[PDB]
Amino acid sequence: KTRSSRAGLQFPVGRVHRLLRKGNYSERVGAGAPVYLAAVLEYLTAEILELAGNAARDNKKTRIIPRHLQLAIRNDEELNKLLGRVTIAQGGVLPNIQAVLLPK
Amino acid sequence: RAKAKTRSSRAGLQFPVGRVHRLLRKGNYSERVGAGAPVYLAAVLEYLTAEILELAGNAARDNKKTRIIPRHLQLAIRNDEELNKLLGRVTIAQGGVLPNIQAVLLPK
Amino acid sequence: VKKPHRYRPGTVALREIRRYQKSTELLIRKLPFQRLVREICQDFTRGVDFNWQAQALLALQEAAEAFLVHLFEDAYLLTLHAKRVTIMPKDIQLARRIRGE
Amino acid sequence: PHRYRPGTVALREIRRYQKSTELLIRKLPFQRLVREICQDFTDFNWQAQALLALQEAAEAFLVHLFEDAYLLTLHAKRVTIMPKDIQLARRIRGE
Amino acid sequence: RKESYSIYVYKVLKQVHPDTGISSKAMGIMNSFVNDIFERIAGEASRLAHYNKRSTITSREIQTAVRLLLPGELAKHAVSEGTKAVTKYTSA
Amino acid sequence: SRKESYSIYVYKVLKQVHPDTGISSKAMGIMNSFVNDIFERIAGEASRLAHYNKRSTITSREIQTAVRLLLPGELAKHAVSEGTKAVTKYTSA
Amino acid sequence: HRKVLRDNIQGITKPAIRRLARRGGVKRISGLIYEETRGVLKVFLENVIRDAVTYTEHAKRKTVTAMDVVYALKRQGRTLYGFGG
Amino acid sequence: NIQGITKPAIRRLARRGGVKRISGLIYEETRGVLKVFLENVIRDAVTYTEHAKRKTVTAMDVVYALKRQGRTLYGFG
DNA sequence: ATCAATATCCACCTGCAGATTCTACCAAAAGTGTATTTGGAAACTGCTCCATCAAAAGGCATGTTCAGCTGAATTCAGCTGAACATGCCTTTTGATGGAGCAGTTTCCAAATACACTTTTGGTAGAATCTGCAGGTGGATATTGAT
DNA sequence: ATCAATATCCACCTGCAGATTCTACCAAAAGTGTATTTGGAAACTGCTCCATCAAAAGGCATGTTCAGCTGAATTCAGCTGAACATGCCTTTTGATGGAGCAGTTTCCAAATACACTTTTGGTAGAATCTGCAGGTGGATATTGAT
Ligand SMILES: [Cl-]
Ligand SMILES: [Cl-]
Ligand SMILES: [Mn+2]
Ligand SMILES: [Mn+2]
Ligand SMILES: [Mn+2]
Ligand SMILES: [Mn+2]
Ligand SMILES: [Mn+2]
Ligand SMILES: [Mn+2]
Ligand SMILES: [Mn+2]
Ligand SMILES: [Mn+2]
């Protein structure tokens, strides 16, 4: 009976709609705009959590922590460009030693 | 009916307070706009315009011309630290660059 | 006899640096630039023969030439940092990685 | 007596600290610095989370600046980060 | 009483990795991410509506904003999902 | 058809600072761009400030805070002086 | 229909790239710079033109305008002054 | 106070950044950059604080100050 | 240290493309007058934040030794700058047809407004579980001598 | 390249404290059912502005030659920076008290919105004005060979 359920979404269409009306974005908000925006947000969240669960169980854990999110984002070119001026608190950096610095 | 005075004249300004008010109310910035906010904004816009035109006139009569062209605006902005920081990601059409040859490249 | 006159390598380059840093004209020829823009626009799926107003083409060329000139300044800083005098592809690519591109 | 050659322990600490995410500046010196700068601007209080957020931002900024500057170090055929490298990286970034 | 996206992020995580969990700090990361992308899309859509002298933000402005803001394949998949949600919502 | 611009006021301010200097049309276009850009910056930051603090009205206080946040140093000091002085003179009568 | 446009990045001649480099202060130019510059210029133009025509077609037009180019540049953090019509 | 940013701490920051060898004049250089950074952020942060008429800067104030310098930070609300 | 060869600079001039002034209309401020909001002034209250204290540890400051990097100095093959002849194609200017922007009108599919009913998301303990401190013990790398 | 001798790394464990999950309650959003209003889509239409067209001339792109200077490759000593042992003090950690300050409520006095109705500033051409572009030709600086 909720708008999210009718669009087949987990993210909240009605809350997205209220945030749109109260964010001083436009005098009016159409019926489909919160549905479209909620769906896009749920998609991007799904992509990130997919890669982060993978990275978290690659290192023998079942708990997503910031480090897993950081490895996920930085190791994927399109996510990395989308979040290129964002810093993930306690996420550290990617392992990276320039090859000229190894012995031999 | 009383004599029509403009909001700019009552604020002692050249920039148009009423047009700034209309632009503020119709830009979907907030449901309401206070009476003094367009005055304050028109005054800041006029101040910054005066600063750029002061420095650009200086550059134009340093180059012995009486009309400001884009090159003068660019010399004005780049030769002033604070304007340069404020317009650091701005491109000025046909403004060129500041002369700058690194000293290492002059003959020995 | 006579020798034909000849400037030493570097003199004319500094002459043209001076000449082009005091001027503001567009440095790419206008028509080839507009053909490049039109070709890229067509080769893009959302281009179904869009027209271009003249001001739009001038705006693009202004932006593109400012971008290239500043990229050359940055890459040349890197060139000089490497104790070289010849700009090299490496310098341009490193300058744009550090810029954030 | 055992002694590692210069460089070996450095690469070990590179590996140790790039795999970790702990803050690398000690808390009290950093928060004391922050409060001093805040007073030298303004007598404000600080949320604890606010100080932690500041320190994360500052350490991330410093680490990425070191990465960029080291790119310049290696471009100049060196291995030793130098002040010139950091200054040139901040010029090229646009600060 | 403070709102957040934690409920829905946890739902999506259970969909994608049923037996993986998430720490409190990473949940804050995800809230920050959702709010950031929301402000990005909503702001771009607001500017689009304004440029064209329209007063209503419609799913067409959201779609153009997603095209402008996401890179490549991410944009294609987000546009597909958004259009699909609008269709299913209009059907019911 | 009818297009508004800031050209009138830019020219008035130019005569104030440089009575015997003129301005070419391309340079006037630069100046129009400048006024619209700074307007958008200040107004956007003021909108964000009002929203953060759950106020529905943008007042001159939000304009002042945004001017402090967006302009550098001495520019910000002098801009605040001019804005405050214009607001007091306008409100007196 | 127009005539067919092909291989136009080669119209960005070597002397034009030299002039751009001189305005940028470069005194000596490696022979491989010209193809690099063409690559970079094409990537730049593609990103901006893609965004410009997105604005154009959202506005239900068949004509790219100067404002469309200005909006696309500003969405790449490259504000351009002088073309506000 | 700037000396509380110890040399081993700067060394650690550099190692996270991949630097293998570190010149002796980097540390005071690093302190300089950090000071500028902190000033720029704190000035903006407390500005937000005093606009809301508060005497306690919050994490959200820091987040707003960072984002207005183009350095969005995730994780603090 | 000079001269011949160029390049650059600089003053002066005039016609015209571009900039500045001048008119008249009219959209859009300004003025008026009621109708809605709202932003704090006082009055609370519970809780984060600061301020002292105190003890301890574990991280840092210091001094020593020396290995290896950086900057300097050399050498040289070949790449890139300079100069130039040739001739192509860009730039100008003007025309010509028509696409398609933009101005205007009409009218619903969609959006807002409002009064009420459900449903949810947030919160805070209770009930479960999971990393993690702090141990191995083998694997894997490093160092010095042959 | 090997062995022998350390040293560090890291995979794996356990018991359990601390972090999440799990329950249940409830203001507050979200949803619903009607009732009205309206923004902008369509459908013309008028007319700028783009797209080609053409021709002319003359500014430049191109290809070639060849020599000077650059990048690249090597060598190597002085001195900087790394590694490390020692012992000292700054930072951590924990407790306890209390101030002061962020939230919250309730009213209004003040401020702002909005519809109508004068009133004028601002805009679009026209009508005038006028720097300065773009020509000379001499003066003055710079460069490179001798
Ligand atoms: Cl819609
Ligand atoms: Cl106000
Ligand atoms: Mn094509
Ligand atoms: Mn030695
Ligand atoms: Mn529930
Ligand atoms: Mn352990
Ligand atoms: Mn209507
Ligand atoms: Mn050399
Ligand atoms: Mn009048
Ligand atoms: Mn001239």
Is some CB atom of chain E closer than 8 A to the CB atom of H37?
A: no
Chain D residues whose beta carbon lies within 8 Å of the beta carbon of residue A87: 56-57, 60
How close, in Å, is residue H22 to chain E by CA atoms? 33
Going from the C-alpha of C29 to that of each of A62, G19, G24, the distances in angstroms are 60, 11, 18
CA B70 to ligand 10 center in whole angstroms: 18
Q: What is the CA B37 to C1' J110 distance in angstroms?
A: 17
Which chain C residues in 14-43 lie under 8 Å from chain G, judged by CB atoms? 14, 16-17, 19-21, 27-29, 32-33, 35-42
Instruction: Answer yes or no: do G23 and B90 touch at CB < 8 A.
Output: no
State the CATH number of the domain containing residue A81. 1.10.20.10
Is some CB atom of chain E closer than 8 A to the CB atom of H70?
A: no
Closest residue (Cα, C1') to J71: C84
Beta-ladder partners of H56:
D45
3-state secondary structure of D81: strand
Nearest-by-CA chain F residue for G74: F37
Nearest-by-CA chain F residue for G70: F33
Q: Is the dihedral of CA C12, C15, C21, C22 positive or negative?
A: negative
How close, in Å, is residue A80 to chain H by CA atoms? 14
Token pair for G27:
């005194």
F60 within 8 A of F83, measured Cβ to Cβ = yes
Q: How far apart are CA B36 and CA F87, in angstroms?
A: 6
Angle between helices C54-81 and G33-58 (to 10 degrees): 140
Going from the C-alpha of E33 to that of each of C33, E23, F47, the distances in angstroms are 40, 15, 22
In chain C, the largest separation of any two C-alpha atoms, in whole Å, equals 67
Instruction: Answer yes or no: do G54 and E60 touch at CB < 8 A.
Output: no
Q: How far apart are CA D95 and CA D90, in angstroms?
A: 5
Q: How far apart are CA D17 and CA D10, in angstroms?
A: 11
Helix, strand and coil in chain D, % to nearest 5: 70, 5, 25
CA G7 to ligand 3 center in whole angstroms: 9
Residue with tokens 């550059």: B59
Is some CB atom of chain E closer than 8 A to the CB atom of H74?
A: yes
Domain ranges of chain D: 1-95
Q: Is the dihedral of CA E52, E56, E62, E65 positive or negative?
A: positive
Q: How far apart are CA B48 and CA F16, in angstroms?
A: 13
- What is the nearest nucleotide to G13, using C1' and CA? J61
Domains, chain H, ranges and CATH? 1-77 (1.10.20.10)
CA B51 to ligand 9 center in whole angstroms: 29
Residue with tokens 């730049």: G44
Which chain B residues in 84-103 lie under 8 Å from chain G, judged by CB atoms? 89-94, 96-97, 100-102
Nearest-by-CA chain E residue for G53: E68
3-state secondary structure of G52: helix
For residue A75, the enclosing domain spans 1-104
Q: Which CATH architecture has domain C1-101?
A: Orthogonal Bundle (1.10)
Scanning E17-71, the segments in alpha helix (DSSP H) are 24-51, 59-69
For residue E46, the enclosing domain spans 1-92
Q: How far apart are CA F24 and CA B60, in angstroms?
A: 12
Name residue G21's amino acid: A
Instruction: Answer yes or no: do B27 and E46 touch at CB < 8 A.
Output: no
Name residue G55's amino acid: Y
Is some CB atom of chain A closer than 8 A to the CB atom of F55?
A: no
The C-alpha angle with vertex E47 and arms to E46 and E48, in degrees rounded to 5, equals 90
Resolution of the solved structure (Å): 2.6
Instruction: Give me the number of domains chain F comprises.
Output: 1
Q: How far apart are CA H45 and CA H60, in angstroms?
A: 9
Chain H residues whose beta carbon lies within 8 Å of the beta carbon of residue D88: none
Instruction: Give me the number of domains chain B comprises.
Output: 1
Which helix (H) or strand (E) segment is F32 a member of?
Answer: helix F25-52
Scanning A1-104, the segments in alpha helix (DSSP H) are 3-6, 13-22, 32-58, 66-74, 77-82
Question: Span D1-95: which CATH code?
Answer: 1.10.20.10
Chain G residues whose beta carbon lies within 8 Å of the beta carbon of residue E48: 55, 58
State the CATH number of the domain containing residue E6. 1.10.20.10
Q: What is the CA E60 to C1' I111 distance in angstroms?
A: 16
Q: How far apart are CA C98 and CA D69, in angstroms?
A: 9
Q: What is the CA H18 to C1' J40 distance in angstroms?
A: 58
Contacts 24+ apart (CB under 8 A), A73-82: A73/A48, A75/A51, A76/A51, A78/E70, A78/E71, A78/E72, A78/E73, A78/E74, A79/A47, A79/A48, A79/A51, A79/E74, A81/E71, A82/E70, A82/E71, A82/E74
Q: Give first-to-last CA distance, chain G, whole Å.
A: 29
